[PDB]
User: Fold Beta-xylanase from Geobacillus proteiniphilus.
Amino acid sequence: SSLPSLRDVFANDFRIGAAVNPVTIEMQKQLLIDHVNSITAENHMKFEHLQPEEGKFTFQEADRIVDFACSHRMAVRGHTLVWHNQTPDWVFQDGQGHFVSRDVLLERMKCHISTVVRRYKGKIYCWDVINEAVADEGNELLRPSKWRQIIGDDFMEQAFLYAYEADPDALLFYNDYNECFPEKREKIFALVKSLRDKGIPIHGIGMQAHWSLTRPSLDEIRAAIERYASLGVVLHITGLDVSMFEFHDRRTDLAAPTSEMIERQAERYGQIFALFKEYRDVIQSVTFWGIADDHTWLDNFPVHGRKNWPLLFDEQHKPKPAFWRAVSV
Ligand SMILES: O[C@@H]1[C@@H](O)[C@H](O[C@@H]2CO[C@H](F)[C@H](O)[C@H]2O)OC[C@H]1O
Assistant:
C-alpha cells in the first residue's frame, strides 16, 4: 500500500509492461493491476497458438489476455506475426509434403496477418511483425528460415506492408535479442535502415533485453540505444529480464541466489533504469518478460529444469532489492 507503483514512478518516461498468459494473469493478478499499464502475450499470439491448422483460428486465450488488459486500462503489444520459431509445419508445406512456392507462402502470410491484426485493430496499438530475423552468429546478415528460403530476402518487407494494410494506425516493430552486442547491433541497424530507405512501414525497433548481470555493458546499451534512435524509429524494451547466470554458467544445483547475486542484480537494475530514464525521449515502453520470480521462462532456458530469479519481485510477490533501486533512479 505504501509501495510505489512502477507505472506511476515512470509515468513521464515510458509505459511499464509484463508478458502474461491466462494462467499467470490469475496467479499474478494483483501485481499486474498495481504496477503495469502494458501487456504482452508471452505465447498465445504466436502463429502456432493462433492458427494451429490452416483455417483453424484459436483466438480464445489471446482474447482473455486482451479482455484483461482493456478492463484495466492497459495497452497491449502484439507478439508476434512472422518468426522462425513456434510456427506450424503446414505453413510451408503442400498436401504432398513438399515446400510451397513464394506466391503461396505470401498469401498464407497475408491471410494470417490480415485475420489476426484485423481482429484486434483498435485494441492492440503495436505489433512485433518480424521476430529475430538477423543472424545471432557468423558473418551473414540473416538467420536461415523457411520464410526466407521459400519467399526470398524481401519476405520482411512483405510482412510489414501486409500488417500496415490490415491496420495502418498500428506501430510496426522489428524485434530482436542480443541487440546490444556491437556486431549484431550493426546488422540490426543495417537491416532496419535499408527497409526504411525503401519506405517500408517499420516504425520501431524492439530491444528484447534478455540480459545478464555482466552482459551487455552499460556502454554497449547506451551505444545501441543511440544507434537505433538515430534511425528515427521508436524504441521499446520488450522482454527485459536480468538472469542470475551468464551464458557459460549452466549450473543446475543452485537452490537460491547468493546474496552477492541479489546485490549485484539490484545494482544492475538501478543502472539500467537510470540509463532508460536518461533516454526517455526515444524509449516509450519497458516490458519485462514476466513480473515476479514465480514465473519465468529462464527456469528452463537455456538449461531445462533449474531455477532463475530475474525480475523485480520474488516468488512471494514481494519487492526485491532490485525493485528499490529501479524505482529510485
Ligand atoms: O515460454 C517461452 C516464452 O517465454 C519465450 O518467449 C520468447 C522469449 O524470448 C523472446 F522474448 C522471444 O521473442 C519470445 O517470444 O519463448 C518460447 C516459450 O517456450
